[PDB]
Amino acid sequence: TLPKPFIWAEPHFMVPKEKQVTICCQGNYGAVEYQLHFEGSLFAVDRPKPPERINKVKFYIPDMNSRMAGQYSCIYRVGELWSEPSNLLDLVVTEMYDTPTLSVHPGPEVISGEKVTFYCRLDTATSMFLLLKEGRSSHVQRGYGKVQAEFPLGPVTTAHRGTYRCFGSYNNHAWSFPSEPVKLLVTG
């Protein structure tokens, strides 16, 4: 019938407080109404006009705050029928309260083969920490620990090069400021 919609965040799902993010929803060409839902509520509506050559709509967020951090989904309509919900997208708010420290073992310059571990520390937060690697091989890892979490990389390759920052969290959707960055240099 109607293909499952797909949503994603731009530039990504990690949104500094007071900053802006957009959520795209892909439905289907000719779809006449798109709704963005946030945790059981209607967040926003788009009505493509003309709809024939449109299969994606953009939902804007001007002013990120803690109350907009949570789970979103999108549905769309062609005729009278609504699609199934999209994948469920989590937005988080960052730049929240305190700043964590990030350290690296054995050090920020290594040769391929050396085992590298990052440690994130933050004093008055939950047990959940996040390690963010920036750039092209850019991704977020979640770890747990009391006041400090470890993030073992194992034996590194050149693939591990990059700039790391870490976050603490006050809840699963509300994160600290990012740590000062650590740039991991890997030879060989």
Domains 1-95 and 96-188 share a fold: yes
Beta carbons within 8 Å of 119's beta carbon, 6+ residues apart: 102, 103, 104, 105, 148, 149, 150, 151
What residue type is assigned to position 81 of the chain?
L
Per-domain residue ranges of the chain: 1-95, 96-188
Contact 101, 53 (CB under 8 A): no
Tell me which DSSP letter residue 27 carries.
-
CA 45 to chain centre: 23
Instruction: Give the separation between CA 40 and CA 56, rounded to whole angstroms.
Output: 22
Tell me which DSSP letter residue 67 carries.
G
Q: What is the resolution of this structure in A?
A: 1.9
CATH superfamily of 1-95: Immunoglobulins (2.60.40.10)
CATH superfamily of 96-188: Immunoglobulins (2.60.40.10)
